[PDB]
């Protein structure tokens, strides 16, 4: 506690961010309330802050940020809690009142997807009022991604603003703007996932999990750093994400900026590469540190087996100080290994731990553990080959079929997962190919596995509240590190009773012709999940034949003049066709 937290935070981060952070905080709790309630609490909360800044003894100035946040939300029944799904929470005081709000964060609130207006419509909306425009935007992203790394979101606001400035006075708005914007959106969709996994890891496996994973990553990134300095960054980063993940976004943003200050302050003993982040303005600085390229591995690194197979004191260290020593290991194997994905290193360190567990209980531990590292080869080998195989098949099929290949895979693995979920995940899984195979072989594993780790996690967190498949609970619950293996290991389900031919899941309306080719794809891809759900022993060619025909229903019927009639004309004949081609 400061004497007035809200003031400290307000002076620390500044008005514009502070408004930013508070908008996001609110957007994130009450994701279902319309923009105007939000702006209301935001300004209400900014007013109180400016007030406190002014004189620290004003009323409410001593309350915790939660208390302030809470109170304001309960003159939000003043704007009818018609939903009010969590008016329950307002009933209790803290900390329950707050804990309660976090329970209700929803990872897929029932909202029309964030819609892209026409290049021109964006451009004007942006010309008219920057404030409102990016308010709405912060509002809209934050509420679909209730765990989105807040500070980065502000960053994305600042980038989206640069792109808008760029494109909104080109002779053609759209062509300047839509690629640059898709690009960035795909990137935000990744960051949202990354952060989601950090939170998931924190909340469901505990601080140690984010710690461990963090140490590994930074060890690869900052190979030259002593283990002391990597630990401090890890502990600071833990705090920031614990905070960010828990809605304490202001403290999180302060703590974050504090941490980047520290690294910049200490770049010499951390990394050469830091220079190019540390000159930058506040958010590009933290952004830049955040996805910085790995430094090169220091020269003169002793073999890893001196310290870990050969010290007489191997068991003495694992026994007397297990965290200290195993972090050391994750630090040392990791800094020596930018070519691995974090989760691979995590697994390795995990095998390294069981081996010592098993071997230090012997009369001869060394003789037991001596091969420990060589025995890593298999674990290094399993994903190595997998990637080569999958990128083979990516190269072969191309994005759309690579996604289809996975939809069909996945829907067979875990058919009880709801369709749009399966459609979503398989598209993202698909995305890995396009994302990583392009890199040269050695660069790929990290790219792939850690990307997969984010996507699989999206699957888990989607699957969590509305849990339907033992197979996914198991893989999601059992080990964070071994998730991907586990999902890869899944073959066809042997329990699922196949779905019935629902006339409508292959039915339509003129409206779907309003959907860009992209949305149209998801529609066929939903058709295809449905179809494997109907007949799972259906051949690829069979499946390809119906999806191909479904593709041909659209291609005729969204013709110049009348679209409505055809659907009703071929539609049922297109149903009939499909049942025919399958059996
Ligand atoms: C800085 O705190 C740590 C250090 C070492 C850890 C090792 C492990 C095992 C080896 C693992 O399952 O990765 C877990 C958490 C850890 C946290
Ligand atoms: C480099 O391309 C890949 C490699 C491994 C993958 C694994 C999976 C999931 C985990 C699976 O169940 O097979 C999906 C996509 C993949 C693409
Ligand atoms: C291992 O190569 C495959 C297997 C199954 C596939 C299924 C599909 C679906 C049926 C499709 O609608 O085309 C596509 C590509 C595929 C590639």
UniProtKB/TrEMBL annotation:
Binding site for (4Z,15Z)-bilirubin IXalpha: 239
Record-linked InterPro entries: ALB/AFP/VDB, Serum_albumin-like, Serum_albumin/AFP/Afamin, Serum_albumin_CS, Serum_albumin_N
A GO term from the CC aspect: endoplasmic reticulum
UniProt binding sites for Ca(2+) 1: 5, 243, 251
Pfam families per the UniProt record, alphabetical: Serum_albumin
UniProt main location, coarse: secreted
Stored SUPFAM superfamilies: Serum albumin-like (SSF48552)
Residues annotated for Ca(2+) 2 binding in this entry: 12, 254, 258
Residues annotated for Zn(2+) binding in this entry: 66, 246, 248
GO molecular-function terms, A-Z: DNA binding; enterobactin binding; exogenous protein binding; fatty acid binding; identical protein binding; metal ion binding; molecular carrier activity; oxygen binding
Gene3D superfamilies xref list: 1.10.246.10
Biological process according to GO: bilirubin transport; cellular response to calcium ion starvation; negative regulation of mitochondrial depolarization
Coiled coil: none
Entry-linked PANTHER family: ALBUMIN, SERUM ALBUMIN-RELATED
Protein name (record): Albumin
């Amino acid at each position: 506690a400061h004497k007035s937290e809200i003031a400290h935070r307000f002076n620390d981060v500044g008005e514009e961010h502070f408004i930013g952070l508070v908008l996001i905080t609110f957007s994130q709790y009450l994701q279902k309330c319309p923009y105007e309630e939000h702006a209301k609490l935001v300004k209400e909360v900014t007013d109180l802050a400016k007030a406190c800044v002014a004189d620290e003894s004003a009323a409410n100035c001593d309350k915790s940020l939660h208390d302030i946040f809470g109170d304001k939300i309960c003159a939000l029944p003043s704007l009818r809690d018609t939903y009010g799904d969590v008016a329950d929470c307002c009933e209790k005081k803290e900390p329950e009142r707050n804990e309660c709000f976090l329970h209700h964060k929803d990872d897929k609130p029932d909202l029309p997807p964030f819609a892209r207006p026409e290049a021109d419509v964006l451009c004007k909306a942006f010309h008219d009022d920057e404030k409102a425009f990016f308010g709405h935007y912060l509002y809209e992203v934050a509420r679909r991604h209730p765990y989105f790394y807040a500070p980065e979101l502000l960053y994305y606001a600042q980038k989206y603003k640069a792109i808008l400035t760029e494109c909104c006075e080109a002779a053609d708005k759209g062509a300047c703007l839509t690629p640059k914007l898709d690009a960035l959106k795909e990137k935000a969709l990744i960051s949202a996932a990354q952060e989601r996994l950090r939170c998931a890891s924190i909340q469901k496996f505990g601080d140690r999990a984010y710690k461990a994973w963090a140490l590994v990553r930074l060890s690869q990134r900052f190979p030259k750093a002593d283990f002391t300095d990597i630990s401090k960054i890890v502990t600071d980063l833990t705090k920031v994400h614990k905070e960010c993940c828990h809605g304490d976004l202001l403290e999180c943003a302060d703590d974050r900026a504090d941490l980047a200050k520290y690294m910049c302050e200490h770049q010499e003993t951390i990394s050469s590469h830091l220079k190019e982040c540390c000159d930058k303005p506040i958010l590009e600085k933290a952004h830049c540190i955040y996805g910085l390229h790995n430094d090169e591995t220091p020269a003169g690194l002793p073999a890893v087996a001196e310290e870990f197979v050969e010290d007489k004191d191997v068991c003495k260290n694992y026994e007397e100080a297990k965290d200290l020593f195993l972090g050391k290991f994750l630090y040392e194997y990791s800094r020596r290994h930018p070519d691995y994905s974090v989760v691979l290193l995590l697994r390795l360190g995990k095998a390294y731990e069981a081996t010592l567990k098993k071997c230090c209980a012997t009369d001869d531990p060394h003789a037991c553990y001596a091969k420990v590292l060589d025995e890593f080869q298999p674990l290094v080998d399993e994903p190595k080959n997998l990637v080569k195989q999958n990128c083979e098949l990516y190269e072969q099929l191309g994005d759309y079929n690579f996604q289809n290949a996975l939809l069909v895979r996945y829907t067979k693995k875990v058919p009880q997962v709801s369709t749009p979920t399966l459609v979503e995940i398989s598209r993202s899984l698909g995305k890995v190919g396009s994302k990583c195979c392009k890199h040269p072989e050695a660069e790929r594993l990290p790219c792939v596995e850690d990307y997969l780790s984010v996507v699989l996690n999206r699957l888990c967190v989607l699957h969590e509240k509305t849990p339907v498949s033992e197979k996914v609970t198991k893989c999601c619950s059992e080990s964070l590190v071994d998730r991907r293996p586990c999902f890869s290991a899944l073959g066809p389900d042997e329990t699922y009773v196949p779905k019935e031919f629902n006339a409508e899941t292959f039915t339509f309306h003129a409206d779907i012709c309003t959907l860009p080719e992209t949305e149209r794809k998801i529609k066929k891809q939903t058709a295809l999940v449905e179809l494997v759900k109907h007949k799972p022993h259906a051949t690829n060619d069979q499946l390809k034949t119906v999806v191909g025909e479904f593709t041909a229903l659209l291609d005729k019927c969204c013709s110049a003049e009348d679209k409505e009639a055809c659907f009703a004309v071929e539609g049922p004949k297109l149903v009939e066709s499909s049942k025919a081609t399958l059996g």
